[PDB]
């Protein structure tokens, strides 16, 4: 399968998540995603075919994971934007007030701004600290998806937020949204990963 940020993948034929970013670890291909999406050795599938397995993850505390892929996977330095793509150029971290977009299998590509950093989300499973908050909307299924600036600087992967009864926070004003992502920087260093860029 072609690995692009924002597309759907399933875990052990059950849950769905979104791909964050294509990366490599030496000769190994992978993608970064949300920790809450799977446990170590869980099976990742894209369009019904097995593409790899969870190599590692941290959740709760943090919300991160990387999936090692088989060799036949094609890593691409891109993030889905409808039918078009945003080119991954690096990982400079943007500051509070910067505009950012996020891509995922449920609500597609949504943009907004970063409103706060170092937020704690109290999930039922336990607290997740150090999240950055934006006001782009998202829905169930978007987790693990890419957060990127229009300039191509990768920011992190979708963790969670304040979803309403319809499954997203797209029906509430930007001012009331709390959409949290895990920073990409600590995930790349923690696993020794390099981002695929174009």
């Amino acid at each position: 399968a072609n690995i692009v940020g924002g597309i759907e993948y399933s875990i052990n034929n059950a849950s769905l998540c979104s791909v964050g970013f294509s990366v490599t670890r030496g000769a190994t291909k992978g993608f970064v995603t949300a920790g809450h999406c799977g446990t170590v050795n869980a099976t990742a599938r894209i369009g019904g075919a097995v593409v790899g397995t969870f190599a590692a993850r941290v959740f709760p505390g943090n919300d991160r994971a990387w999936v090692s892929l088989t060799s036949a996977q094609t890593l691409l330095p891109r993030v889905a934007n409808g039918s078009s793509f945003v080119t991954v150029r690096g990982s400079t971290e943007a500051a509070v007030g910067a505009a950012v977009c996020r891509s995922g299998r449920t609500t597609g590509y949504q943009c907004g701004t970063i409103t706060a950093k170092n937020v704690t989300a109290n999930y039922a499973e336990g607290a997740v600290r150090g999240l950055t908050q934006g006001n782009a909307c998202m829905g169930r299924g978007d987790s693990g998806g890419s957060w990127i600036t229009s300039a191509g600087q990768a920011q992190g992967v979708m963790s969670g937020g304040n979803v309403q009864s319809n499954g997203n926070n797209c029906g509430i004003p930007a001012s009331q949204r709390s959409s949290l992502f895990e920073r990409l920087q600590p995930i790349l260093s923690q696993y020794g990963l390099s981002l695929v860029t174009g």
Binding site: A34, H36, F59, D63, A121, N122, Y123, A124, E125, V128, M138, R140, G141, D142, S143, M158, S159, G160, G161, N162, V163, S178, L180
Partner: peptide
Amino acid sequence: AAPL
């Protein structure tokens, strides 16, 4: 807040 929920994970996703």
